[PDB]
Design a protein around this motif. Structure first.
Motif, PDB file in Angstrom:
ATOM      1  N   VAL D  57       0.846  -1.237   0.000  1.00 29.44           N
ATOM      2  CA  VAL D  57       0.000   0.000   0.000  1.00 29.44           C
ATOM      3  C   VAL D  57       0.864   1.264   0.000  1.00 29.44           C
ATOM      4  CG1 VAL D  57      -2.412   0.432   0.625  1.00 29.44           C
ATOM      5  CG2 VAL D  57      -1.129  -1.254   1.940  1.00 29.44           C
ATOM      6  N   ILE D  58       1.481   1.610   1.134  1.00 28.34           N
ATOM      7  CA  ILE D  58       2.203   2.918   1.220  1.00 28.34           C
ATOM      8  C   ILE D  58       3.717   2.707   1.143  1.00 28.34           C
ATOM      9  CG2 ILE D  58       2.690   4.831   2.816  1.00 28.34           C
ATOM     10  CD1 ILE D  58      -0.704   3.234   3.008  1.00 28.34           C
ATOM     11  N   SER D  59       4.372   3.395   0.199  1.00 24.88           N
ATOM     12  CA  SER D  59       5.848   3.291   0.047  1.00 24.88           C
ATOM     13  C   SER D  59       6.523   4.588   0.508  1.00 24.88           C
ATOM     14  CB  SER D  59       6.233   2.937  -1.369  1.00 24.88           C
ATOM     15  OG  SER D  59       5.762   3.908  -2.292  1.00 24.88           O
ATOM     16  N   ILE D  60       7.373   4.509   1.537  1.00 28.06           N
ATOM     17  CA  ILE D  60       8.144   5.698   2.016  1.00 28.06           C
ATOM     18  C   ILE D  60       9.628   5.451   1.719  1.00 28.06           C
ATOM     19  CG2 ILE D  60       7.658   7.428   3.790  1.00 28.06           C
ATOM     20  CD1 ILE D  60       6.417   5.418   5.522  1.00 28.06           C
ATOM     21  N   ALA D  61      10.530   6.263   2.277  1.00 27.78           N
ATOM     22  CA  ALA D  61      11.958   6.021   2.105  1.00 27.78           C
ATOM     23  C   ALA D  61      12.783   6.169   3.359  1.00 27.78           C
ATOM     24  CB  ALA D  61      12.499   6.954   1.017  1.00 27.78           C
ATOM     25  N   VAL D  62      14.084   5.941   3.210  1.00 25.65           N
ATOM     26  CA  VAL D  62      15.006   5.992   4.331  1.00 25.65           C
ATOM     27  C   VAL D  62      16.412   6.326   3.832  1.00 25.65           C
ATOM     28  CG1 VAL D  62      15.951   3.614   4.371  1.00 25.65           C
ATOM     29  CG2 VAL D  62      15.382   4.766   6.518  1.00 25.65           C
TER      30      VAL D  62
END
Lengths: 62, 205, 85, 90, 82, 80
Positions: D57-62
């Motif tokens: 569902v939700i893709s973020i980053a790092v």
RNA sequence: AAUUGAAGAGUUUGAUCAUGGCUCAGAUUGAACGCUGGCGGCAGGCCUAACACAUGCAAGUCGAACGGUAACAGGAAGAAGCUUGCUUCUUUGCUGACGAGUGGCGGACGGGUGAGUAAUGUCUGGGAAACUGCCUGAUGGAGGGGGAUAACUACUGGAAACGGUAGCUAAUACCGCAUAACGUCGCAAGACCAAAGAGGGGGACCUUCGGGCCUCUUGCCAUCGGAUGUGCCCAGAUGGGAUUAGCUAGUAGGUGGGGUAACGGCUCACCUAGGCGACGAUCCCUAGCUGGUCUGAGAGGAUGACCAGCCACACUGGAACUGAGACACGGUCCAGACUCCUACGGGAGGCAGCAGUGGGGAAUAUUGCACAAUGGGCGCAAGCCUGAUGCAGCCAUGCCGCGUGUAUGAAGAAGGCCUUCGGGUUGUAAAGUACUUUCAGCGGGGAGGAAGGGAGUAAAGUUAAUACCUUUGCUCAUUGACGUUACCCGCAGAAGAAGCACCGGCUAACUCCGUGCCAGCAGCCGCGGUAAUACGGAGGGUGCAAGCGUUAAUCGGAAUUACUGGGCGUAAAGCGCACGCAGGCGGUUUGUUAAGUCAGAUGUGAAAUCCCCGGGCUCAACCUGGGAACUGCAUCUGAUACUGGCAAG
């Protein structure tokens, strides 16, 4: 220490875990090592189909 | 790791014929030998002493296709034994199976000869052997497997090799291929165009 | 660890409890002899030496004390008394 | 292979030497197995029971504190790449 | 307790043994007192497969040695009359 | 016979004991020149007999002291 | 039969000869890395952090020591279904076996690692003041009694670990007593010390119905020896630094008591005032040592991985117990640090054991299989256990063998790269033609590694007995982890299988195009400023090959540490000069000694490794027989030139 960047067109930067092999770069004073291209974050050269065991270029597909 | 390339190109790099592609056309016509190993092999060099040692080392190499790692072992073996290292090098090299296959005439070229040997169709002394670097020991015999005998490669080897000089230290049955090998290979019983001190000088260092 | 030959621990504890008692039994008899040599009275020194001799030789058979140590302790006592009287 | 078998009482390890049908156990080892894998008996008929793969569902980053941990960043999240089906890395 | 046992030499699947007098506590191929003979279990057809030093094995008997299983069996295989 | 040395008396400032010096004319391993390699031994003897400067036959025995493990056989060549 | 063995080149200068460093040509590796990558055999595979470690296993066995039997299967008096002997079950340690415990033996061996350790150690060659389970030889005994205590019971404490209390039964457990010798002590006379019973078979007497009795098997304890191992002493050898000159105070020795398996300041008491040191003491840094590996013509230099001997350590530091042997890897206790369980009271553990993990690093594997063979522990044996070992897996890391075809084939093809533009080259290289077809893929056969051991039987022993036990032949049925093994036989087909580096000189091998001191190459000298054989891309050619180069590493070349085998007037180097102790060397003659020296003998110089003539895997690597060798060292007996010591001139 310092080291030489062989070939041309390196994608190196401020911090990169690389690998180092020794070798005199005589024309450069006080540089005694060579970065081995084919290793870690220092990637291979482009258009180096000849002598590609050094500079780490793979064999072209066929 | 065998040679697997264009064949007579080595003979034009050596000028003379090393009998590498004998076959049916027993006359070297379509070869243009000696003056064309490449695009610039139509000339001559000053050919230094290192080169004349190496090119002579290449000729004794290329008749029997011995790779350098295998070739250097003979020099370690020849200098180990008694006698002369110039004489011992060729003597232990004559005892190779494909060398005795060629000297008895079972093969017209060494590449044709080794194809018989590697495919285990030869019962030397009572045991079939498929490794061509087998030392054919003195005062022995060599037979051919009957259940793979005479499939038009053996007969053409029987024809041509009986026109070629009829070798000395061994007897060919010539009817059904029963080779017998008798004595020690002597320096005088050789092709004699090869030299020997060119090799053992190069292998000192 | 929890190997089942760890009974050799408690088999040694009851063994040492048997030893140290009987080891002190020997030594205390040597103390009574040595006290008589500081005393100097001969018959008390002789009888004590004639008392513990069966005690010393017996533990040599049980192997708690080596024979030559038991032979040494005989040779210790008789040398001290003879030079005295 | 099958290295070790454990009945797993809430991440507690007791050793199982034989498994029957209908029981839950943990197999230790198993280098290349994925989610919902149909482990069957070889040198025998082979079966199949798997049909489902849920949604991301939700893709973020790092980005870590330094670049010296970036090799562990691909490794430890790669260590987490083997575990969860609905958890991807780009 | 000095014994007369076998020590295994050779390569994988092609063994070889040399029957040796050794102190039994020590390792198989390790520290030994004396090699006395050898034995080949894949002894291809040449007559030499065992050359047992019989007299010292008879001498070590008097010294209180314990002749092992196959070592005693090889003496029963290579008899005391040949 | 038995193993017995020659030596030379050096330090006799003590009782019932002597440190003897025995000369070894060994060959050097690499240079081939003979060196007067000395060797000093704490050697036990009987009651205080001799003085410095006299060759003394000495043989190996029990470790009579911490260091003294040799016994003086006899005193030869008494001098000033 | 056993060393038939030693090369050089580039580079200072306008050019030369030298001195002189730097570099390359060779071999080797526990190697990593880049690119590529078909198979098989024998190998090797944590070199760094002795860094911390989750989990499973790494040491048990003994019933032929013993009370017992909690399980399992039994004959067994019987129970109940009720197909009246078909069976559900109750008895019962009386059988074969056997947890939990007592007791015996092992666990101190194997396996690991190299932190410490510069000499307590190690290699070499010797010694004297010892001890040594098991195995072995000889000489004898092996009499007679006792009190507890596990186990288990009744109560009870705890979460477990583990108990605590009161009764209770056995032992090849323990404790006296008798009785001693070729034993210990003692000048002597004498005094004192040990031991245990189990297993098989049975004529006959006796049967308290067990047994005693006999025989056989084995174990037991005492003494003197063997063997093996162990502790100990002594001589030499065993790294760098003098920018490390004095060092030591149980320290150097005596005497006596005690200690020690045995010797000794070993440990104290008192005395003596010494001991070590320029042939390097003390101190600091680094390091396990050796057989040997690598290289070298040799001498030496570097090194000490794998295999084998030794030593040290076992989380860090200290101590002792037990026992034949440990100051103990998988033992105990205490202190410290670090983790784990928990009911919070209290307990548990040590991968430097095999795998395996995080981590460190450029850098290294499978929580695998079987106890089939060899070896070890216990046992009568059968057997049980065995991460030793044998094997399998992954990894071209190394060495060795093999393949990806052979022959034929010219229009000298097409295409590419050139072309003095005519041709040439790639190149008989491909196509096509005819054959071979190993290894891989596949289907069937097929060794040996296996000797033994089990039951029975005959014979000889054997004893009062044709019994038992022991040995010997003999028959039957069996024992294979690896393993669809090694190998073999047939099927289909050229078909599944070739790269990497270099090409100015060194050094084998060249042109064209792009590029213009840029982009970059490079081990050294050096190339690139618009015609580059050195830069990058093609084509051509050479080298090597399932590997090939790059880097690191050691010796070589390097006679640039020169012992063999160098120099010092100007090239680097005579102290500014002189006196002189230690020390080094020393004219000539005789006598004497034999230390050095040399000759012969003896012991040893572990095995392996290395070398030679052989043997076995189809060859080879590899495994393996004998020999040579280990050039050494120590001892013994001689020779008396030379050197040394001594005596005289």
């Amino acid at each position: 220490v310092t080291s030489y960047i062989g070939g041309e067109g390196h994608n190196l930067q401020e911090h990169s875990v690389i690998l180092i092999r020794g070798g005199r770069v005589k024309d450069l004073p006080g540089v005694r090592y060579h970065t081995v291209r084919g290793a870690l974050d220092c990637s291979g050269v482009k258009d180096r189909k000849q002598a590609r065991s050094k500079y780490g270029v793979k064999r072209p597909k066929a | 790791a065998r040679y697997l390339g264009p064949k007579l190109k080595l003979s034009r790099r050596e000028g003379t014929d090393l009998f590498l592609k004998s076959g049916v056309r027993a006359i070297d016509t379509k070869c243009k030998i000696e003056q064309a190993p490449g695009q610039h092999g139509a000339r001559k060099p000053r050919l230094s002493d290192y080169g004349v040692q190496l090119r002579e080392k290449q000729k004794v190499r290329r008749i029997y296709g011995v790779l350098e790692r295998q070739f250097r072992n003979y020099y370690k073996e020849a200098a180990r034994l008694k006698g002369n290292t110039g004489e011992n090098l060729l003597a232990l090299l004559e005892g190779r199976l494909d060398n005795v296959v060629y000297r008895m005439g079972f093969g017209a070229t060494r590449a044709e000869a080794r194809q018989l040997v590697s495919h285990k169709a030869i019962m030397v002394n009572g045991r079939v052997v498929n490794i061509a670097s087998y030392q054919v020991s003195p005062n022995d015999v060599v037979s051919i497997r009957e259940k793979a005998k005479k499939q038009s490669r053996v007969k053409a080897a029987l024809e041509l090799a009986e026109q070629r000089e009829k070798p000395t230290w061994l007897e060919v049955d010539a009817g059904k291929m029963e080779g017998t090998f008798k004595r020690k290979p002597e320096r005088s019983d050789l092709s004699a165009d090869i030299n020997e001190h060119l090799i053992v000088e190069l292998y000192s260092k | 660890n929890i190997k089942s030959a760890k009974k050799r621990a408690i088999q040694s504890e009851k063994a040492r409890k048997h030893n140290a008692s009987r080891r002190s039994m020997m030594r205390t008899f040597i103390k009574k002899v040595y006290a008589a040599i500081e005393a100097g009275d001969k018959a008390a020194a002789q009888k004590a030496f004639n008392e513990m001799q069966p005690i010393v030789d017996r533990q040599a058979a049980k192997g708690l004390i080596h024979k030559n140590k038991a032979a040494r302790h005989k040779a210790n006592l008789t040398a001290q008394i003879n030079k005295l009287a | 292979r099958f290295g070790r078998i454990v009945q797993m009482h809430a991440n507690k390890r007791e050793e199982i030497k034989e498994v029957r049908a209908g029981d839950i156990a943990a197999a230790i080892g198993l280098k290349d197995v994925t989610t919902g894998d149909t482990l069957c008996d070889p040198d025998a008929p082979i079966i199949l029971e798997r049909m489902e793969f849920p949604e991301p569902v939700i893709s973020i980053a790092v980005e870590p504190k330094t670049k010296a941990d970036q090799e562990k960043m691909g490794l430890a999240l790669g260590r987490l790449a083997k575990e969860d089906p609905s958890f991807r890395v780009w | 307790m000095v014994t007369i046992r076998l020590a295994r030499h050779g390569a994988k699947k092609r063994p070889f043994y040399q029957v040796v007098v050794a102190d039994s506590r020590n390792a198989r191929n390790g520290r030994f007192i004396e090699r006395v003979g050898f034995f080949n279990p894949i002894a291809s057809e040449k007559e030499e497969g065992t050359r047992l030093d019989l007299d010292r094995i008879a001498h070590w008997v008097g010294q209180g040695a314990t002749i092992s299983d196959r070592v005693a069996a090889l003496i029963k295989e290579v008899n005391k009359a040949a | 016979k038995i193993r017995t040395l020659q030596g030379r008396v050096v330090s006799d400032k003590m009782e019932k004991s002597i440190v003897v010096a025995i000369e070894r004319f060994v060959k050097h391993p690499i240079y081939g020149k003979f060196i007067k390699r000395t060797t000093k031994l704490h050697v036990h003897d009987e009651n205080n007999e001799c003085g410095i400067g006299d060759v003394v036959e000495i043989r190996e025995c029990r470790p009579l002291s911490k260091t003294k493990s040799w016994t003086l056989v006899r005193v030869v060549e008494k001098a000033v």
